Symmetry: C4
Subunit: 199 residues, 4 copies
């Protein structure tokens, strides 16, 4: 089953058949397409067998849906047909299991992030509530905003408008940024440690 | 009966969920939702904090000598999250209680306290590197408020906005809009901005490495 | 003691933006003398990287279009600047390190791809008709989600869909969260293969 | 004469001395019209008292290496009343106060060799690219691809992921394959950088633990 090459030109086929669809085809060497689809099929076959004889549940649910040759049912089929890539390249499996063990830790630290944001978004909706309501109006948007500021995406747009109405403006944001910036750091480290010990 | 349930992953997940939903659903932003469902979620949440008050009066009757920074944290977070009970409340002290109500999450999950102790530890390093960043910012924000001051006082008018500007640049946020105007005057503009970014980058980097090795010494390899 | 040479090559590579009366030209002809002792040094060795030092040093050996062509002028400048790797050896290291990372990176990229296909679909279906400029087809759904993936001013992508569709954030936020965790794993995967050599 | 060679080393006297440098560093001086005149005046006086104190310290420990040179040259400059760049030097006596900034600056200077090298590599990538796009998008959008200078500056902005769609998108609607140019560029840079971070890490643990 394995072999690196094969699997690479197989990633190649799966992908190219996942990305053809379909508006970008108003013209092109249709024997080329015949062959890409044929091959694509030959693959759903390849593992549809190896299966014969936890991740096998997934393997066969996938391969089964990828077996089938509507507007949404179509797009789903596109999605599972591309999922069979995982069955194929078996390092992707070990990797997915790695993520999954990252999930507990990430879920905790994430709860922390939620605490931090809720605080800053309450203090924020209360502070910036009526001066710029599009971001601090209610608590939900307050959080969506603080979440933009967390990821440092054009955050000066949120802050400066408040900085010319309230001198202490940066203290709010920088502290916020800095505090979030710190705990992510411990998330990372924690996973590292948990990834090493677990060995 | 009670000493047992605080250790269940499914209970902690549903409870955490209820706490969050209870702290986020509010208040005229739901001026239309299944009032039956919110009624249920609130009634529950309060039920939960009842369940904590119980658990802790227990751990208390327990210490054979009735006399853990937690104990204080915990019973204050809970006493405060208990009786007061706010909602869509106009100003202004309850608005803030909502915050301790959500702080209960730490009471509901051990690894939260452990993670927090871990962070408080990372604070020494983060603070000294924060001094070094201050120095760098001050050097660049001064060269800057001197060089760029009469050209764009929007961002280099005084020392203060020069620093805010460079903090905006440190995080790489739309920094092309801070520099790119200086480039169409002073051709050296690039040297200034790039050097400051590279330097801040190197220092933040060495910080991360610092902390990483501190934790790493504090466990494995050996 | 190398530095100087880096200086001549680098300099004579970024020099067109009205100075150095004719010292510009000393740097010219002199930056040309550099290649020749590699055209020679390379001969001096006999009885892998040489397929690179040879092709580069050699394409650096070719002269240059007068008041003419300009076609292959620029390609030539690229090779002339590529000699830097031939002379600096620590760069040959760096690059062997990079190419050692290329495999684990290839796999985790396949994975980020699957996430981007699922979200570019989920998302083209949801937002396809409210912002075809970002969501019209797969193509820009993938460019767009990739801009989000790099957190580059991504609140411009999401905030429109947040006026129309209350849940927008669940879509975008999970998209980011998922991506983050997976990228995270990779680093810690790589930053363990390398220490593996050490023990 | 132990008083000094034994006072630069008090946690609390330190944080005091930083608070004061910093203050008499952030205050100076877009605002002194109203604020307790006696108070800012005081702040300058004791700030100066501080540097006088450091001068006495050195002499005193002297009487009984890079950091004595940087410490001597800085406390030396700080003693003075092209030159607006005076006040800058003084802020640097913080590093003379706080052993920790000394240790951290030392470790950063260890970072430099590898960083210079990787920056070479990234210079080479940015060059190949800014050249390729200097040709490709020069006649379509030239306030950022019109010459090597702006192609390199512009590719640096892309490289820090800052507002990058604004560079790439307007080329995307002229050329279908741009995504390939920008996306591959970014992936490359990323890979090389990740190899920097790690290399520096390895470096550091190889400075002790095996
Ligand atoms: C593939 C790329 C490699 C990934 C490296 C992973 C390193 C994890 C860093 C997580 C955040 C930690 C930064 C931090 O705690 O600094 C605090 C400062 C003050 O607060 C800040 O100013 C935060 C600054 C964040 C700037 C955004 C980019 C991160 C900095 C550059 C990454 C460091 C190595 C070059
Ligand atoms: C990891 C931390 C994640 C925190 C992000 C939570 C954001 C919650 C935003 O709520 C939303 O607020 C909108 C503004 O009114 C409402 O329109 C919408 O109905 C509501 O769902
Ligand atoms: C890495 C740490 C860097 C922290 C940088 C802090 C800089 C704070 C800028 O000061 C502020 O400048 C404004 C400009 O007008 C004033 O309005 C305001 O009163 C003043 O507080
Ligand atoms: C980390 C993996 C992410 C990779 C992202 C894949 C990019 C797919 C974009 O497709 C492009 O869409 C354009 C929009 O129409 C077309 O013009 C163009 O022909 C087509 O090539
Ligand atoms: C990782 C290293 C990559 C950094 C690349 C540096 C780009 C050099 C740009 O030069 C600038 O070009 C402008 C355009 O003409 C001139 O106006 C200006 O005078 C000149 O300084
Ligand atoms: Ca960014
Ligand atoms: Ca040892």
């Amino acid at each position: 089953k394995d072999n690196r090459i094969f699997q690479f030109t197989v990633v190649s086929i799966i992908i190219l058949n996942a990305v053809l669809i379909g508006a970008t085809t108003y013209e092109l060497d249709p024997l080329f397409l015949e062959t890409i689809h044929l091959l694509d099929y030959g693959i759903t076959i390849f593992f549809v067998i190896e299966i014969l004889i936890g991740w096998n549940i997934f393997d066969t649910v996938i391969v089964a849906i990828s077996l089938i040759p509507s507007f949404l049912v179509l797009r789903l089929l596109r999605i599972f047909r591309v999922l069979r890539l995982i069955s194929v390249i078996p390092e992707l499996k070990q990797i997915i299991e790695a993520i999954l063990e990252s999930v507990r830790r990430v879920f905790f630290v994430s709860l922390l992030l939620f605490i931090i944001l809720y605080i800053y978004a309450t203090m924020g909706a209360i502070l910036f509530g009526n001066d710029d309501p599009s971001r601090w109006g209610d608590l939900g948007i307050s959080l969506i905003t603080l979440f933009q500021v967390l990821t440092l995406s054009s955050w000066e747009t949120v802050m400066l408008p408040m900085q010319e109405i309230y001198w202490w403006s940066w203290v709010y944001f920088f502290s916020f940024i800095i505090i979030c910036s710190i705990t992510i750091l411990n998330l990372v480290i924690a996973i590292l440690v948990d990834v090493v010990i677990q060995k």
